[PDB]
Structures are given as structure tokens and as C-alpha cells.
Scaffold this active site. Structure first.
Site, short mmCIF file in Angstrom:
data_model
loop_
_atom_site.label_atom_id
_atom_site.label_comp_id
_atom_site.label_asym_id
_atom_site.label_seq_id
_atom_site.Cartn_x
_atom_site.Cartn_y
_atom_site.Cartn_z
CG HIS A 118 47.04 8.68 11.77
ND1 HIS A 118 46.90 9.14 12.88
CD2 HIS A 118 46.87 9.85 10.82
CE1 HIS A 118 47.11 10.24 13.08
NE2 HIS A 118 46.84 11.02 11.78
NE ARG A 146 69.71 11.00 -3.65
CZ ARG A 146 69.67 10.27 -2.91
NH1 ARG A 146 69.27 10.56 -1.51
NH2 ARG A 146 69.97 8.98 -2.99
NE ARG A 197 74.24 9.98 -2.86
CZ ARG A 197 73.68 11.18 -2.38
NH1 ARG A 197 72.96 10.87 -1.17
NH2 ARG A 197 74.21 12.38 -2.44
#
Ligand SMILES: [Cl-]
Ligand SMILES: [Cl-]
Ligand SMILES: [K+]
Ligand code: NA
Ligand code: NA
Lengths: 251, 250, 251, 251, 251, 250
Positions: free
Chosen positions: C5, C165, C220
């Protein structure tokens, strides 16, 4: 208004409800150019986003990157912008001896060797494509002239130990995956890849239509190496097939 | 060689490679008589076995009883005798409000709320039907005039708490299944049923072709116990469908 | 001998045994820039690879993309090429009220809400960084004048439901993750990100040294989508720190 | 008034609070005829229901079919009609060399290799019989003159791979059950069957009294085929024992 | 005002906020006498409790007994009395070949082969020590001149099968732990011990500071039962280290 | 040949094949003195070991300490030295309203809320006592005059969150155990305890005979505080009962 990762708005999508989602950002433009009036929208991280028109209808092409996590983000944010149908396209290595390079695999179900699928549905939930999408993909793949395999795909969160590769740094594989390839082979599993379990589970549990189609560019049971010509044809057919599948999905 | 439970030989099946597998033993003859030259083969426990002919080809009809366990026995023993394709025709409860009693549901994948599937493949493995079978069932259902739905089925090892029924002796549902019906419903799951997870996982992992079509005899939006008025009509429609689906598979 | 990769060779690395691994490909050059003689090596998919020199020693900077899967590929292939130490620098959402946007968090352990970690070690195995790396990261962070927090990170295979979320397409969160943020908050977990569990588990079980330092781009307790403001200056501090952390590891 | 699957009412049961539950519907009449005034109530699916009288008290005999799922239905619907005590009777295949054909096994606990038990209690919960029932069964079994084994029974959701049989269509057994019979043997497990884990867990967690008694008609570790007379005696003894156990349970 | 199990009051602790927690009750007096004004507080069950003074600050020494269960009780009840820092000093078996008897091992993370940790945090949560404690333990051990190892500890709910000991009554090891020691060894796990998973998980999820340092009393690549000859000496060095680690934690 | 933790030899046990295993080391002598010729063998860690004689037969009394881990060590090391039968005795807190202080509970099966049991058998395996031991315990308990309860015991690896106690330092209970007491109560579980799952699973899977008996000294569902007399009477009765249970076993 502007989704956090993709960097694109609903307006940029021009009413598209369908997205073709390759893994590699470099493949996005290539797919977009198969359709009409391809337009570059954005490129951030592994997410390259194009728009194109197929039979007068807008189609999104968006790379997902490798793996369920980055894929789940692309799907979610596209879904926020109105995309309801997701066509996974790529190339893959088969693990069945009867599957040849150049053949097409349409995923009917995924072995969930991932983690992201669990963030949408418990493990007992089937990583299954939408029936219409799988049908459209089978139709497009068969109409291409290629041999088409409808079957189960092993979807791994890793490229190496999860696909039982031993040619690695440690050269070993965790207990769970030792002898796993043979186990999948015996269970009729067609191939390994790294995004379908997340994609299929996420969509099938979220009211989105998804499916996976892939051209076989190698077979791990075969020692023969495919030539550059066959690989190029297989890559091209795979994206031709996914675009025609999109055409069959559009109304 | 005579299989342990079914009590039939490969010769009894007369070259049949396809089986129609209802859960109810009483449905076996009813299915068989929709085909040519139906012959009773055996009846042992929940396993009633008929043989019939469809467009010149032998077809086995064999009840599975209720549940993954008794189903897995039937499929395995039929497989030992050469059967490769299995069409479950069953009864089911819809958990989506738009589905009507009398509708048909073809399973595209099963939520594995069973135990027997785990005896053939780990939980990660998808309980998915053979695509040709699912396609044949959809086509047959449409061509039989039935209203058909394609989608995910929650396949439970129990009829009561695993399908979150509260009208029961204890009225309790174990923590794992509390709120499960709405969770499945939210996830777009179409129906509850008891054999598809086992059947689909077992076959998809064993080189066998399987699928599940089931007549909706109840909508859980309304009630927990299926009305007894529409049962026979729904069943009759479902068996017409599954036989036509078998015809398409042959 | 090029890895599959990353498209780089052991020779391309010039003897580098340490890699800095940001998630964002765009951040790779920015990191290499802080070091001597930065050189572009390769860019394929989410993997952009640069080589640079730190105190006369070669250092690799290689993006991982988002998620455990793409990260595990980068780490494995870098390891095949002689890299033994991996320093993740990234972005994160703090879930503790006392942690501010712009702060830095050195992960002492990760909650394994991923799937890739399981491909290297069973769930019982601790997603724990190398002690020397965590030590070096803490010191580097402190010496940079910023406020540093040592603690546990919740590492999720998803950005949306796995970090609980709700402002999403479905607005739903699977049963497993319902109320999960409060659970982690109550357990003293500092932040969410998406790669540490995979990185730490993989390395701690493969004889590789790893650590994770991340810039807080959102709290958050306030909102779900990070402000685009201060995203840059938070990023700037984190990479300053990780380079100094690398310098400490090479000493 | 009428239970959906069994097709009987509380009135049909005539005040019975105890049910004998064989697996085979063809065996229901045999058991009922051991008692006074046997009366056929209903036959639907795998459910054949009889009523009889034992020492002046009504007793239900109801087949369950093979497996926890069909069993769970019968128990539930019988429970709705007032049955509180469930005596499982049948014949079984032992896996211990010391357990001979003709012996009686009374289950003290079941290995939960099923799925249905989990629908009543988490796996941590013991599939255990009611002590009075187990006591009554042991007493009746010992009074029959047979050698009686009190011990753990492995309760499998399958007849073939879950009991590690390889003489099958595929000849394969999943990882989970490979070498499992030897494991159970070494742990002192007496036999395999397919209903007890569900029955015992369901009842123990639902304020119902249950137990399992079985005559041994075959031994997985023995090659000798028992003669017709021995098999007939064992079958007959098993149902004589369960009825005598019922008698001891009646108050 | 006396805690349920430990039989001590907050007044007994004389303002101690730090506990040294050995497993062996006999080790408590030995630890306490390394410090100033050692005083016996209480001894009930496996809980021997001493108090002492280190640099003018009160320190409580409390045995936990063997195992996560009795440990969790001690930690909880000490935490109820104001203890916030817990220093486990234990005995351990080396998994790696070149970790010798007499060496000190500071746990950077624990493989959770226990049950009690699950009562504080799900398995995904890392059994990680507080960074300051681990730092203090490393510093104390290295400053002491001892041979120190930093790394992952396999923390088992059993001494025998969970640490893959075969010289036992049955000589059997459950499937889960068959070949587990080599697996841990290959993954770089340093040692076996029985309390660190519970201790570290409990504290890291409860706002308490914990760490584990242990003296190696056996190398498991050689034998299963520790030689008695080197026990006392190894213990003596370990407690010298933990007391010095306590000193570093106090301020 | 002395076992590592217990510090005793096979000769020390004088042919004992049965052990009574309380959790508290202080209770070992109290049990041993109910029998003939009690002799202190060893005391290391939580393991106090006595030998005694019951009807001419050697019996060992050995404390296990709190929890499955320390218990598993004692059982194993005693088993190496010829002990085959293990009688756990103690006192416990009931979670059922109908279980009063002074009553006796004989475990028929344990909810495995522990970890050590998994080191002997997978979770599917039942934490069941030997039937003779449970039978002997019920009889001995009944003969003492106490009301006896046969039933399932929830065996927890912790004293606090695993038994859903909120009066703790954090006041927090992990998601798994939130609402768990009510769950067990509804399932008819009699009490909480910390050793039985390990003991019973270990022994039932290792050819050892085990059982658990406990006097109830507190009820989670009762406001009333038991007086000192009844408490004292209950712990005394529990060890009297276990000795009589041992007698029946020999
Ligand atoms: Cl239904
Ligand atoms: Cl050790
Ligand atoms: K203990
Ligand atoms: Na990625
Ligand atoms: Na059945």
C-alpha cells in the site's frame, strides 16, 4: 450545511440520491468521467468527491478510504446531504479456486470481521445488501459478459492478520484468525475485503440502500500472476459495471 | 442408508435435489398436492415427508417442525440424501405497520436470534439466502398476485420473549430482548420468524441454496396472537408461492 | 521490495526506525517540514509518506487515514521496512468538562471500541502505549508550554454513533452506545478518537513501540461538530509536540 | 382461552398443574395410558396433548418436538393454562464410558449449547432443575432398579455439529465444537440432548419447576448395538420413571 | 464508622491518602516497618492493616489477599476512608525467558483474565495504571538498582489453569487457556499475576490512582512452582521498591 | 511435597477426602472443634488449614478467603492432596422477601458473575453442586430446625457493584450490573455470594464433589435489623449444619 469530513454541501450534490463509493480517491475522477459532465467537488483526507450526471440524473462519486471507519463517515455525511443509495465498487482477491481473475463478485452477505458494523447493529444483524441494489449489480455484471459470483464476502478490519496473511512483520496471527481462511473457504466465502460489513450493516439498519460489486484481480489459491492487460480490463469493467448498476437503480 | 430422523433413503427421493420445507407437518401434503404425483414417504416426530414432481423433476416436501434445532436436522439429513436447495415456506409476524396480514415476506437476511446458526458458523457470518432462491421467491410471489416484501427478518429461538411478546405467563422479557422489537423495527427489520437464521446460516455455510418466504399472519403493531380467521387463506397463498418459486429454481 | 500500500522501500526510509503517523495526509508534509531535509516519498490512497531527518537520524512521516483498518496497514508495512516506533499525532474530541479546546492528551490507554485491535489481540489485552513513548510525549507536550493531560482515550470505529453523536441522518444510536459517552465520562475517559485502540494494541502485542498524542478540537460537552476556528493552531501545537517527542525517543 | 400453538384451553387440562413433556408426539398417548383415564386433548404441529389422572389428580402429557424453541412454546402455553411443574422424559445418548444402555440420567444441570435459554436468562444463569423435581426423578429412577447417574447434560441446538458428529453432508464442525465432545467428557458431562438447557433455564428463571430424566439407549463411546428387547425395556422404564416422579411431585 | 471488611476507621488511617497493598497479609508488617512509626490497626480475614509514616505523611498498608474479588473490597473500603492512591506490591511469574527471579516488573497494562474488572468497566476498557504511579514505580525500581521490566502483565483469576499450569489435579486446561502462555509470550507479555487487572481497571474507572509492581519469584519457561529459597529476598527488594515509590507519590 | 499456597502435605491430611471450606480463616478452628481431634496444620495468607476427625474419618477444614480466585487455589491444592469433596459454608445476604434471617440456603446452581469459573469451563457450563452434597446439605439444614431454601445463588466477583450496591466511593454501578438485583430477584435468585460460581464450576468440571450452604444474616429487601442473638445463632447453626452435611457425605 457543510459536512465535517467530506467538505461538501447538499447544493453541490445537485439533487443526487445515489453515490458510487470507491475506496481509492484516485479512482473517483475515473468513475465520474464515465458519466456526463463530471464535476470535481472536493478533496479532503481520503475523501475525493465528484458529481456527474447519469441519464440526466446527478450521481455522487465519493472515495471512502480503506476500512469501515472512514467508510462509515462518508456514508453518514452523504446521507445527511440526501444520498440514499450507495454502490460500493472496487477490485478484490478471491479465495475460492473456481473464481477466476476477471470475474465479478456481487456481495449477498458479509462476514462481519469488522468493528464499525457493531456501531450500527449488534453482531446478529445480517450484513446484507439492499435487494434492488444486489439485483442491479448482478444484472450489470452479467450484462458485461463477465462470469458473476453471487456470494458471501469476508469483510476484515485488517489487510494482514484478519485475512490470515503470515508474510508479515511478526509472521503470526491471533488465535481467532488462525486457520480462518480455510474455514471461510469451506463455508463458501468468495473473497476478503475491508469495507462491506460496515457499509452493508450500516445501510441495512439505517434505511439506506447499499451493495458491493468487485472485479477479481487475483486469486490467493492460484500461483499464476495476472498480466497487466487483464488487470486493466478488470478494473475498467468493474467501474463500467457499477455505473450501469447505478443506471438500473435510478428512476 | 436411511437417515436417522426423516426415515427415508436417497432412493425414496427419486433424484430430488430441491426440498420445500414448511414448519407445520400438516402443510406438507397441502404443498405436495400442488405438484404432480405426490407420494407420502414418511412421518416421524415433527418430520412429515412427501415426494412430488414439478415439471418432470422430483421435489421433496418435508416439515421441519418449529425451531432451528428441528430444522437443522431436516436439512442435514435431506442434504445427505442429495438435496441441495431448500425453500422454507412459513408463517411470520410483521413488525412494520405498513405490512398487511396475508402479505408475503421474502427474507434477504436474518437477524440471528437463534442458537443453531452458531453450530454452523460464528455470529459474524451473515444469515443470507441464496440469491437465486430469493429472486425466485420474489418473482413467484408477484406472479401469484401476492403482495411481497423483501427485507431483513429477525429470526428468534423463541416465540414469546425473543419476539418481545409480553402477553405471557410471567409477562417478563429478559434484558437482552427488552425494547428489541422497536430496535429491529427502527432498523427496518420486516418480521419475526423462528427458522430462517438457522436455515440460511447453515445452508450458506454448507454449500446449500436456501431461502425463506413466509405468509404474514399477524402484525405486531396490532397484537401478539395471530387471528385464526386469516390463517388458512394466508397459508394457501404462501404454498402457491413457494411451489412456483420451486418451479423457477428447477 | 516495495510494500503493497505505502509504495515505499526499506531503502527509501534511509534507516528510519521511528515513524510519525498523522491521520490526515495533508499533515504529513507539515510534520516533515519541522524536521531536516524533508523529502516526499510516495502518495497512494490515504497514505502520504515523507522522510526527514531529526538530530541526524532518519524519521518517517506517514498518514494513516481515518480508522484502525487503514492505520493497521500503514503500521504493518512500515514495520516490515524496519520501523519499530510509531508516534500518532491527531485530532480529538474531549469529553471531560475541564479539558479545553487546544489542549493535548497523551493516551495512557485506549477503550477498544474498534475492531482492528481484535485482529492482533483478544479484547482482554490492554490497548496501552509504550511507556517510553508516553513519557516522551508527556515531556514534549509540557516543554511546548501547552496544558497536557495523561489518561484514557475512547477509541471508536465510528465518528458518529460510536462517539454517541445524535445529530445524524437517522438520529439513532445502537443500544450498545446509548449513554456511552456519559459512561466514559464517569470513568474518567478524556477523549474520543478513532485509531489509538488499533495502534496501541497492534504495537503492544507485536514488539513495536507506540503512543498517541492528540490536539483537542472540540469539547463534546458543548457540541458534536468541531469549530473550524482554531483547528489550525491546535494542529500546529500537536505536531510541534510530536516532533519533540520523536526527538526524545531517538536520543 | 385457547393457546395458539397447543390448541387447548385451561378447561381441557382439568386443573392439572403438572405436565410430562416428551419430545416425540407419538409417545404422548403411551405415557398418558400409564395413568388413569387418558384423554386425547389436541394434536397440532409437534404438539400432541393428552390428559390423564394420577392418584386422582389431573396430569398433562404434551410433546415438545425436538429442540428448545418448540419446547419453550409448549412450556409457556402450558404455563399460561396453569401448569407449574414440567417433567422432561425421553431417551438419550451418553458420552461417558461408565454410563451404560439402560441406565437413567437425571440432569443436575445443563451445558447451554442452545439459543432459547438466552431468551429467558443471560448465559451466566445456570440451566438447573428444580431440586424437588430432580429429587423425585432420582428417587423414581433408583426405585426402578436401574443404575442412575446424577450429572451435567450437554444441551445442543443441533443433533450433528453441536454433538460433534462428522458423519455428515459436509463432514465439518465449526471451530467452536471441534474437540467439544472430548472436552465435555473430560468435564464429566454425561450425555448430549437438545431441550434441557432451554427447559431448565426457562423454568428456573420463570418460577416454574422443571427437571429432565432420560433412559440411555446408546453410548457414543460404545460400538455395541443394544438389542430390541433392551431398547424397548429402556424406553418403557423411562416413561414409567417419569410417571412415578410425577406421583412423588403431586401434593 | 468502621468499614465492613477492613475493620478500620478513617481515624485509624490518620489522614493517609495512599495505600500500599500487598497480597500476602504477612507482608504488611514488613512493609510498614520500612517506614516510620509502624502501627498495627486490624487483622480480619485476608485483610491485615497497618499504618506508618513516610516523610511525615501517613501511609496505610493493607493486604488484599489473593484475587480481584478480595482486592476490590479492600480498594473500595480504603477509598471510602479517603485513600486515593493504591500501590500493589506482589509476587509474579515471568513469562519471558530472560526475565529472571528477583527482577522487578512494573505493569504498564494488564491482560484482563479476571472477572472483577468487568464489574467496574466493560472489557474494552484498558486495565492501565495511573501514569504518575507507574512513573514512580519505575523510578523507585531503577533507582534501587533492581533489574526492572516495564510492560504488559497477564492478570488471571486463577493461579493454575489461567496461567496455563498443567501440573495439577486434572492436568487439564480449558480451551481458552490452552497455548495461552506462548500467545502472551509472543505478544511480549512479561508476567503472570492475579490482581492487577481488577486493581487497575477499578481505579482507572473510579478516579483512583493505581499501579502494580511485582517481584519475579519464578520463570514459567522453566517450571510451574516457585522455589522457596529466593522468595524472601525477592519480597524484600520489592517492598523496598514500593515504599520508595510511595515516597515519590507523596508530596 | 507441600502444596505452594496451603503449605500442607498429603500426609498432613491423614487420608482426608472431604474438606469443609469457609471463607473466613477465623472460622476454620470453630468448624474443626465441632469434630474430633482437631489439629492446626498450617496458616499462610487467607488459608488456615485444620485437620479433624468425623466418625473416625479424617476431614480437612480450610479457609478460602473471599472470592473465586483464592478459593480455586485452595480447592486445587487440596485436590492434589487427595481431597475430592468440598463443602462450602458461610453466611449470606438474601435478595428474596420470603427468605428470613436465620434461614439456610443450599445452592442448586449459581449465576456465574465471576471470572474464575471461566478458567475451568466456558460460560455455557452450569455452576451446579454435586447432587449428593446438595442433598446432604438440605437434610442437615432441615435437621437443625432452620427453614431451608433450595435455589439459585448469584455469585459475584465483587461485593459492591456486582451486587448492585450504590453506597460506595463512586456511587456508580457499571452498565452490566445496573438493575441486575431486580433481574435476579425476578428470576427467583435467592442470594448474593462471592465464591460458589467458581467452586461449583471448578468441581463439577473436574470430577470433584462440591456444594454450598449458607445461613442468611441479612435481607436486602427488609428494613428490619436482625438482633445479635439471631445473628450469633445463625452463624453457629451454619457450621453445625455443614459438619452434619459432611457426616452424611462420609
Ligand atoms: Cl408471529
Ligand atoms: Cl507465579
Ligand atoms: K482472597
Ligand atoms: Na481510512
Ligand atoms: Na421442533
Amino acid at each position: 450545511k457543510t459536512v465535517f469530513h467530506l467538505g461538501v454541501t447538499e447544493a453541490d450534490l445537485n439533487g443526487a440520491t445515489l453515490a458510487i463509493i470507491p475506496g481509492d480517491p484516485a479512482r473517483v475522477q475515473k468513475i465520474a468521467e464515465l458519466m456526463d459532465n463530471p464535476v470535481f467537488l472536493a478533496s479532503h483526507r481520503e475523501y475525493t468527491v465528484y458529481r456527474a450526471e447519469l441519464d440526466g440524473q446527478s450521481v455522487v462519486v465519493c472515495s471512502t478510504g480503506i476500512g469501515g471507519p472512514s467508510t462509515s463517515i462518508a456514508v453518514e455525511e452523504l446521507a445527511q446531504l440526501g444520498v440514499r443509495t450507495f454502490l460500493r465498487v472496487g477490485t478484490t482477491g478471491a479465495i475460492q479456486p473456481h473464481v477466476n481473475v476477471g470475474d465479478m463478485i456481487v456481495t449477498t452477505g458479509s462476514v462481519r470481521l469488522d468493528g464499525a458494523s457493531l456501531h450500527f447493529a449488534p453482531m446478529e444483524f445480517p450484513a446484507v445488501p439492499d435487494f434492488d441494489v444486489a439485483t442491479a449489480m448482478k444484472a450489470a455484471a452479467q450484462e458485461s459478459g463477465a462470469t458473476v459470483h453471487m456470494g458471501v464476502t469476508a469483510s476484515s478490519d485488517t489487510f494482514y492478520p484478519g485475512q490470515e496473511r503470515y508474510d508479515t512483520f511478526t509472521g503470526r496471527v491471533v488465535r481467532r484468525f488462525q486457520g480462518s481462511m480455510k474455514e471461510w473457504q469451506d463455508m463458501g466465502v468468495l473473497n476478503f475485503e475491508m469495507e462491506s460489513a460496515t457499509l452493508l450493516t450500516m445501510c441495512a439498519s439505517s434505511g439506506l440502500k447499499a451493495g458491493c460489486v468487485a472485479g477479481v484481480i487475483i486469486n490467493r489459491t492460484q500461483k499464476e500472476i495476472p498480466d497487466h492487460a487483464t488487470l486493466k480490463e478488470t478494473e475498467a469493467r468493474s467501474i463500467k459495471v457499477v455505473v450501469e448498476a447505478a443506471r438500473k437503480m435510478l428512476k
